[PDB]
Design an enzyme around this catalytic site. Sequence first.
Site, PDB file in Angstrom:
ATOM      1  N   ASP A   1      -8.971  -2.000   2.803  1.00 52.46           N
ATOM      2  CA  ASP A   1      -9.471  -0.636   3.064  1.00 52.46           C
ATOM      3  C   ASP A   1      -9.101   0.297   1.901  1.00 52.46           C
ATOM      4  OD1 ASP A   1      -6.761  -1.112   4.222  1.00 52.46           O
ATOM      5  OD2 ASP A   1      -6.920   1.064   4.567  1.00 52.46           O
TER       6      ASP A   1
ATOM      7  N   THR B   1      -3.361  -3.652   8.015  1.00 55.76           N
ATOM      8  CA  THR B   1      -3.867  -5.040   7.952  1.00 55.76           C
ATOM      9  C   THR B   1      -5.225  -5.143   7.249  1.00 55.76           C
ATOM     10  OG1 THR B   1      -4.527  -4.815  10.299  1.00 55.76           O
ATOM     11  CG2 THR B   1      -2.380  -5.765   9.824  1.00 55.76           C
ATOM     12  N   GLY B   2      -5.896  -4.025   6.933  1.00 62.42           N
ATOM     13  CA  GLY B   2      -7.034  -3.933   5.998  1.00 62.42           C
ATOM     14  C   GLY B   2      -8.386  -3.966   6.702  1.00 62.42           C
TER      15      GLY B   2
ATOM     16  N   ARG C   1     -10.391 -10.773  -2.318  1.00 59.27           N
ATOM     17  CA  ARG C   1     -10.400 -10.024  -1.042  1.00 59.27           C
ATOM     18  C   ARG C   1     -10.166  -8.538  -1.348  1.00 59.27           C
ATOM     19  NH1 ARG C   1      -5.473 -10.611   3.248  1.00 59.27           N
ATOM     20  NH2 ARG C   1      -6.057  -9.001   4.774  1.00 59.27           N
ATOM     21  N   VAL C   2     -10.948  -7.701  -0.683  1.00 58.78           N
ATOM     22  CA  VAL C   2     -10.814  -6.225  -0.792  1.00 58.78           C
ATOM     23  C   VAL C   2     -10.487  -5.683   0.594  1.00 58.78           C
ATOM     24  CG1 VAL C   2     -11.881  -4.059  -1.521  1.00 58.78           C
ATOM     25  CG2 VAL C   2     -12.476  -6.173  -2.712  1.00 58.78           C
TER      26      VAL C   2
ATOM     27  N   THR D   1       0.836  -1.202   0.000  1.00 58.44           N
ATOM     28  CA  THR D   1       0.000   0.000   0.000  1.00 58.44           C
ATOM     29  C   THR D   1       0.875   1.259   0.000  1.00 58.44           C
ATOM     30  OG1 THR D   1      -1.445  -1.329   1.309  1.00 58.44           O
ATOM     31  CG2 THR D   1      -2.012   1.075   1.089  1.00 58.44           C
TER      32      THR D   1
END
Lengths: 135, 134, 157, 158
Positions: free
Chosen positions: B32, B54-55, B29-30, B1
């Site tokens: 943030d 970590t999302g 998987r998506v 990111t």
Amino acid sequence: TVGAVALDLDGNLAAATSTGGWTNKLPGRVGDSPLVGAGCYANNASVAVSCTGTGEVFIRALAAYDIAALMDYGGLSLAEACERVVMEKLPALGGSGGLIAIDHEGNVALPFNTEGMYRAWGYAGDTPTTGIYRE
Amino acid sequence: TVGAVALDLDGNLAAATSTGGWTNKLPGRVGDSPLVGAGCYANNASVAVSCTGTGEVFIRALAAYDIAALMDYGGLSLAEACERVVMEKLPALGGSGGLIAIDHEGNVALPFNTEGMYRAWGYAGDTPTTGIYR
Amino acid sequence: KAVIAIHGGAGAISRAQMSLQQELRYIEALSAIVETGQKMLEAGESALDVVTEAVRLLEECPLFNAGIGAVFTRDETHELDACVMDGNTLKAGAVAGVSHLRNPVLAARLVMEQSPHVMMIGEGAENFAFARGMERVSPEIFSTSLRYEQLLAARKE
Amino acid sequence: GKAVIAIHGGAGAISRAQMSLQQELRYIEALSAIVETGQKMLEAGESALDVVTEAVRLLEECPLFNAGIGAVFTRDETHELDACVMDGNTLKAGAVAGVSHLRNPVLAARLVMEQSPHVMMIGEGAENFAFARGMERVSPEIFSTSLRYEQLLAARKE
Ligand SMILES: [Ca+2]
Ligand SMILES: [Ca+2]
Ligand SMILES: [Cl-]
Ligand SMILES: [Cl-]
Ligand SMILES: [Cl-]
Ligand SMILES: [Cl-]
Ligand code: NA
Ligand code: NA
């Protein structure tokens, strides 16, 4: 778009939202419905919210979370937060639609700025209320 | 990111975030990063934020919008809002990571609860600062 | 007071597992990109143009997990996501799950500026970007040895 | 306070002039049946999570409402379904977007929440995950209704 919010006998809040999107939608477009804090949010400390409307404005304004934050941080009642989001903030961005909300104290609100919203609500053990048009 | 936030000479705020996800990610998987109010948010009335971590916990806590709301509705300073989100709320939900934020006054914060965060910042007309570790 | 900040990711970065040459390459890359943004802000460029260009450069830089240098999924593929938001209009654009667009942040800005929408996913996002004149790339353009070796290490553990 | 449920089947341009009483009573009967199911579940001590999941599953099953069976059509005469669920007690959430081969998106969203570490799954990846957890693949035609197909043809003419 459809949705539900509930407060159970243990004092837990939950929300759910589901949609097919829009007639003639651009394939791959995503509205607010599957997005946490846009079309669906629940937190035992504040509120459960499910939204319905034009989509993009509820994402840009984080409508479901904004109800929670106005109550938790701003000290607004559920009625005050619903008026601010649905009747003031969403129209200011060109948004139309509505939402359903239940707070941790069992207050329920079904605000909408549209001609109608298919809706119903009821306290456990009581007769339910249905609606389509404005009151 | 990766991400960037900026306040321009006209007083406009903006944020952007971009990622490849996680090594060995489950396909589909998506996190943030592409979610308004989770990994990326900007509002001229409050703050511009870009997150990294970590999302899932940044989605569940709407981390980027929560900074804005704590300031706008809570009256927290940028420093107070960053401490609350990154050092208290995200770890409580089992999350780790950080964010970068600029408020409408030109305050800048780069909080993180991890061993490191690749980061830099600089005012227009001044020298830049970079960082890796704490 | 105009100002930029950038990040290239938070996580378990430890001195014990890093070399000085690696740290210098990160510092050089971060310094070059933040300086580009500072000079754009000094020249009166918009916050939206500055955050777009800084993220485009972090995408192009293979050191950072975005665009070129993306991590690999379980399936040895790349799935890229990005968002941009304009604080002046509260307009936003986002793409998730794209594999055939070089610069996801530019595809996010394309959703914001060249559609009525906020978020596009997967092949539908790619087809929309292509219809708007964005180039289709081979999915391997993002692939690097460093990130492939990290996938093999994750499979060992 | 007291246990309570609210549901919706969408907000928009709904006018008496454009509607008939026969249509109105069909919607009122559907909303009443679903909210009463939820009220009875709450009265019986069922969780808020189970109640909202069941209410949305029933709104999906009901062809009157634009979710699951009765979904609108995309520009390409396909169905693309999205859903979310959130538990206010744990602040866990699950969501799917861009699914075409899962009968009940809200049940797929609940699988993401309960049977993965994740919050949101999209497209093929979401479907493959759901199939691995035992959800069945359906034909995308199961959602299709003449009412929504005629609305697509009219939107194209417009
Ligand atoms: Ca100086
Ligand atoms: Ca420009
Ligand atoms: Cl009436
Ligand atoms: Cl350092
Ligand atoms: Cl050396
Ligand atoms: Cl099939
Ligand atoms: Na890169
Ligand atoms: Na339905």
